Design a protein around this ligand. Structure first.
Ligand SMILES: CCOC(=O)c1ccc(OCCCCC2CCN(c3ccc(C)nn3)CC2)cc1
Ligand SMILES: CCOC(=O)c1ccc(OCCCCC2CCN(c3ccc(C)nn3)CC2)cc1
Ligand SMILES: *C(=O)CCCCCCCCCCCCC
Ligand SMILES: *C(=O)CCCCCCCCCCCCC
Lengths: 62, 266, 279, 4, 117, 266, 62, 279, 135, 4
């Protein structure tokens, strides 16, 4: 059940990809740590809720 | 197979269910089930409103008592339902409305009671009036709502000319309309004969010279309940048993929406 | 998946099939769903009965006993230098009521021991950390008469040595019943009076009781020789049934318990006053 | 294992 | 369950009003919500299902207006009618049970049992 | 097909047959029919005795009368049958005995009578006592034989400390055991509601924490009959109708034969 | 001897099936934790102990 | 990779395309980059938004409560031998403000408990190490009236037994909401006044409040019988939301909180004085 | 001073709506309290700064540009369906970001008209009509 | 392993 992922290495030792291992010990997922591997998304639903979304080089009002 | 019967029915419409253990089968008026207006019979062009479960469910009217002197009761549709929940609201907010109905009449007693109710569903049940004055019954009197009206054993002409009652005077053996009651059986009907059945169940289609009409101006169906054979019990000369009428709109649709109609029933 | 059945879309009815009518005289509960009596929509159901499974219902450590033991100068009068408790779920009410929804049960048992202590008197110096001995004495085995006599040698009886301040002690016990299942209820006697008996006490027995010692006792003591100042300690025992199976459901206890059997004494009035036509 |  | 004599007849309306309005005081108001008209006869018993109609996904087991379930009421649709030499009065027994869609969660201690010092 | 029904049963065991024309189907407790001890569940090693037809037949107990004040009756099994023919002899000659039962409760009246009997088969029916003294009911009092015991509407504590009665005090709404009667329906049961059925028929499997036990020391099943709805008739304030209990052992087997047990019921 | 099972994931992190691992350390099964993977069953032995079980749309008494 | 977009090399412009002009009336934010208005070079971008993800923003244990409990001689007047706290993030301000950037949320919750103690008085002898019981009482469950009454038996309620001096206690709680998401804001009432009500108190309710008990309480006590000398203890509760999801953004709280709702009272002047043409 | 104390009838103005204020006048009369909202404009009537209200769905009616605003609202809630009588889902706030001005006439006035349409409306749990008390 |  071990889960293996690559670390995003910031300061590299003078010694390439480094990994870390995770194992869940409990049946209830609420007990689990946070994966912190979070996908992002477009702001458009907030920055552009327009029915006709227009392109920035064209006149906003036409 | 299994154990099924002509006498035991369950009717379910919307959030309402009726059970009966003593039915005499059930009638579908003129062999036609209720249905919506078809595109090739359509006349108003505006998109209809179909409220479905909110209106097409069972409304129970106020109970009437049947006793040895009871000459009979009558009701008109849609009028008896004008104040019934969302059906009533839809009827008064639209110029046009069509609807079919399941009528369930309820009257139980005991194996030692006696009597027979004639239950009649009449298309265009025009009733006779009070007076020397013809076609003079007022709208408010023609339309009793949930209360319904009654029959009389004889014609008492409303004499007071000067300030006329403008009411119907429905005589029982004339079916309240100038014909003989014994022939009312050509109309869709059932009999509640107390030794046989607790109830009557009649399914009514929309019947009219038009696909849709004004429900406020025009009643489509009349419900007439007359005692074909008088109520009797043991030797007690003043017996009384309840009759309860439960009615459900079916395939209801409305056209011509605008502000609400508020008729004057004073 | 372990989700409950979906709600089916159900429309109007005019038929000879009548689900709404029945006869409870038969002993049966009418198997009805909302769609048998009202018009329903389709609902994809995701709810589940995961937390109400037998294991999940009992999967909790419950307090069944508070054993008190003293550590002080062995004087010469009835003291508490050691204590004994008959193992049972009946000195407490909460778990007892839960187990008694069922007639018979079968399970493994997990025991957890919380030990607390304090200084009994205003002051005579202090006390070095105490080690506690919890010894199980099965029926038949020699019971202690003295806090440090030979029985505490525990050569064959299981003992726990608990150090004060350490994480609460924990052990597991197998299913140890003389029968194929534990009887939460026993409508019988351990003895029968016979017509040929000498005194009519030979055959007398407690109603509902089975063996005299049931499952034995836990003998508890402080292994430490006494300090000058007295230390009083309490051992709280938490019991959890695990790997559980239960048979034959019962109505829950509705009135206060009155001892180890089904006897009631008072507060025989469980239900409140409410008017017939009051919401 | 489940090495991602 | 109707525990009257076999010579006794009657029609009863049993109902369920989802929360939010005035709790029914008349059959007239009760008719408007979920209901069953029970006809007494050889089948002695009637079952009204109270359908899960809630805003929240789970209601509370304690009393709370935010998670209230509504109102159950019963009325005579016609009346009990007996012959002579027959008892004019009788008992009705009632029963409750869960449908197969019912579930519960968050285990807790009951107030229905307790213990003195 | 042909004409069969849920209400008409014939039960035949050994030289005995029961007919009923007004049953409400029949219950098999926990869905399990009686059966003999299987080799892989067997514990006593000695060859069992299976008396078959001589013991597994219908024994009818003494009739009890149901009247307006009757709070209820109870019986224990095998105890109610301890003196019943060869079943009783087999029970007292062996240390061990297991047996299942068909219980048939009988109570007819008339279409004008009224009332409902709750008939309950309870596994391990431990009853509450007389006293401040816990678990103190005497063996002879715990075991009424064929007579059975009764219920009370309330708890009268046997006060006489000095020479105690050592009897049960079974209060009806507490099912004689500290619980509420309305929940007794989780136990295998039927209702004799007089407008519906003459009788109840419950088939009981052997239920125990063991495959076989001492029948003299331990009762397996309790039979509780309580009036859920009181007996009523016409207007006669002191009506009385008989209740008759007929019980049959099924799949009876006995181990550990020796000289006869003679319990002291004084 | 490691045993691997899927968790029934309730609140999903913004990061699919997650697992947990179990190993028994003791010879006596009484020492084991609770699997909590419990199968259910029909209520019928309680809700319907009838010799002739009948179907809900038919008359209970016939 | 999770790095942000690279800057594109952009040169001079003389065109009919005008990115720099727009109309905010539409409800839209102008999607511009430096290269739309000034000449830019190519930049290979390595920066990322890893630490500002929803999980990373809340991934920290925040102090939500300080529960105080005493262990002393049970005298006979209002004491602190046990304490109760309604579970909430609203007795504190810091995490409350963070959660309130969003209208709705859904998450699992991690609770960590730091327990500290001290001697209340100059001196009467000392105290042996204390064990604390933290019991969760969900709505409906019997609440304690006394520090050692039957409710502490905890047969079904979850309890933590914490030993003083041990690493701080820690548990996890599932998403336990009655809805599909937690409402940080509820524009409504739990009851509606009806025209047919008797008193007009029947239908009265607090604005914005939903259930009366929300999520229940934590009952805390010292399991130890009292020493002669009094020991006062504080349990600090740190809350962390994990496996987090949030919906519908909101403006942050700009003025001091005034109770559990959105009510403001004073310090309604959040902004400093700065001259229009002053840097 | 009383928190979460606004009465249902005051919280719900119907078609009339309510107004904003430039400042916080605390309803002082303790003894027979008004139980009304006191929505201060720069605090968006709710303890936050108005300039950030733009993270909410919005449009601006700037009179040199446009006659009107059109916003399409989805049902938003922690549930798929709820009590409409007990709970409001959406609030519509209209505040003058820049004050009305005309020629030199110091007391100008122009009408604002709000037209709203329900969309994809569905209802469950039918029974007798709710009649709330708005007195 | 015994992965179920
Ligand atoms: C009297 C009514 O209750 C019961 O029927 C009933 C049934 C089962 C029960 O399970 C307990 C049986 C096991 C008894 C003991 C066996 C061994 N135990 C031990 C043993 C060693 C140690 C160090 N600590 N505990 C503790 C429990 C407890 C009670
Ligand atoms: C009132 C406003 O705040 C909220 O809406 C809000 C929303 C969600 C929140 O999450 C808490 C819900 C879970 C409540 C409790 C559930 C169980 N808890 C336990 C349980 C057992 C133990 C021993 N320790 N803690 C502690 C928390 C807390 C608050
Ligand atoms: C998948 O996990 C298979 C590999 C297991 C490697 C050894 C794991 C040792 C840790 C056991 C965890 C037990 C948790 C209850
Ligand atoms: C099956 O378990 C084979 C894989 C073992 C992985 C390493 C386990 C490390 C833990 C050892 C447990 C010892 C228990 C007495």
């Amino acid at each position: 059940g071990a889960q293996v992922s690559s670390q995003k290495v910031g300061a590299h030792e003078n010694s390439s990809t480094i990994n870390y291992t995770t194992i869940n010990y409990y049946k209830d997922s609420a007990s689990n740590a946070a994966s912190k591997q979070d996908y992002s998304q477009d702001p458009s639903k907030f920055t552009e809720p327009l029915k006709d979304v227009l392109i920035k080089t064209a006149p906003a009002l036409n | 197979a299994c154990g099924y019967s002509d006498r035991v029915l369950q009717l379910t419409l919307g959030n309402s269910t009726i059970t009966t253990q003593e039915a005499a089968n059930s009638v579908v008026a003129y062999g036609r089930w209720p249905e919506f207006i078809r595109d090739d019979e359509a006349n108003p062009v505006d998109q209809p409103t179909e409220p479905d479960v909110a209106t097409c469910r069972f409304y129970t009217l106020d109970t009437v008592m049947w006793g040895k002197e009871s000459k009979g009761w009558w009701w008109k549709l849609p009028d008896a339902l004008r104040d019934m929940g969302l059906f009533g609201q839809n009827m008064y907010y639209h110029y046009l409305g069509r609807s079919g109905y399941t009528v369930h009449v309820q009257c139980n007693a005991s194996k030692f009671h006696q009597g027979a109710l004639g239950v009649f569903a009449i298309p265009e049940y025009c009733l006779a009036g009070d007076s020397d004055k013809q076609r003079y019954t007022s709208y408010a009197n023609a339309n009793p709502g949930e209360r319904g009206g009654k029959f009389y054993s004889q014609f008492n002409k409303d004499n007071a000319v000067t300030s006329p009652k403008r009411e119907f005077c429905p005589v029982d053996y004339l079916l309240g309309c100038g014909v003989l009651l014994g022939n009312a059986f050509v109309y869709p009907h059932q009999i509640i004969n107390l030794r046989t059945n607790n109830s009557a169940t009649i399914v009514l289609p929309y019947v009219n010279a038009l696909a849709i009409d004004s429900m406020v101006k025009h009643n489509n169906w009349g419900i007439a309940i007359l005692p074909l054979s008088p109520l009797d019990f043991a030797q007690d000369s003043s017996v009384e048993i309840p009759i309860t009428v439960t009615i459900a709109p079916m395939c209801s649709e409305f056209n011509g929406l605008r502000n609400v109609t508020a008729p004057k029933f004073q | 998946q372990d989700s409950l059945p979906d709600t089916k879309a159900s429309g109007p009815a005019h038929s000879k099939e009548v689900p709404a009518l029945t006869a409870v005289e038969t002993g049966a509960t009418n198997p009805l769903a909302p769609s048998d009596t009202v018009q329903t929509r389709h609902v994809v159901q995701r709810r589940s009965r995961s937390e109400s499974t037998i294991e999940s219902f009992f999967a909790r450590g419950a307090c069944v006993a508070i054993i008190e033991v003293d550590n002080e100068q062995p004087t010469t009068r009835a003291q508490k230098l050691f204590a004994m408790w008959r193992i049972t779920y009946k000195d407490t009410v909460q778990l007892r009521r839960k187990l008694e929804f069922f007639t018979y049960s079968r399970f493994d048992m997990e025991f957890t021991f919380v030990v607390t202590a304090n200084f009994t008197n205003a002051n005579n110096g202090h006390a070095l950390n105490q080690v506690y001995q919890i010894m199980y004495i099965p029926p038949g085995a020699p019971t202690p008469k003295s806090w440090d006599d030979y029985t505490w040698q525990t050569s064959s009886n299981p003992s726990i040595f608990y150090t004060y301040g350490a994480a609460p002690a924990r052990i597991s016990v197998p299913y140890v019943g003389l029968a194929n299942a534990y009887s939460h209820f026993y409508d019988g006697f351990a003895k029968v009076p016979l017509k040929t008996d000498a005194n009519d006490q030979i055959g007398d027995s407690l109603y509902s009781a089975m063996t005299v010692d049931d499952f034995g006792v836990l003998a508890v003591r402080v292994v430490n020789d006494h300090n000058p100042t007295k230390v009083t300690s309490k051992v709280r025992i938490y019991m959890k049934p695990k790997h559980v199976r239960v048979w034959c459901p019962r109505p829950p206890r509705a009135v206060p318990y009155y001892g180890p059997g089904v006897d009631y004494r008072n507060n025989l009035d469980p239900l409140s006053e409410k008017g017939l036509t009051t919401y | 294992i489940s090495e991602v | 369950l109707f525990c009257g004599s076999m010579m006794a007849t009657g029609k009863i309306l049993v109902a369920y009003a989802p929360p939010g309005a005035q709790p029914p005081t008349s059959r007239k108001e009760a008719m408007l919500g979920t209901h069953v008209i029970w006809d007494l006869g050889l089948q002695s018993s009637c079952t009204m299902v109270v359908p899960w109609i809630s805003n929240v996904t789970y209601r509370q087991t304690t009393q709370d207006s935010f998670t209230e379930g509504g109102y159950i009421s019963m009325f005579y649709q016609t009346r009990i009618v007996v012959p002579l030499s027959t008892p004019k009065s009788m008992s009705m027994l009632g029963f409750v049970s869960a449908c197969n869609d019912f579930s519960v969660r968050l285990l807790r201690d009951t107030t229905h049992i307790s213990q003195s010092a």
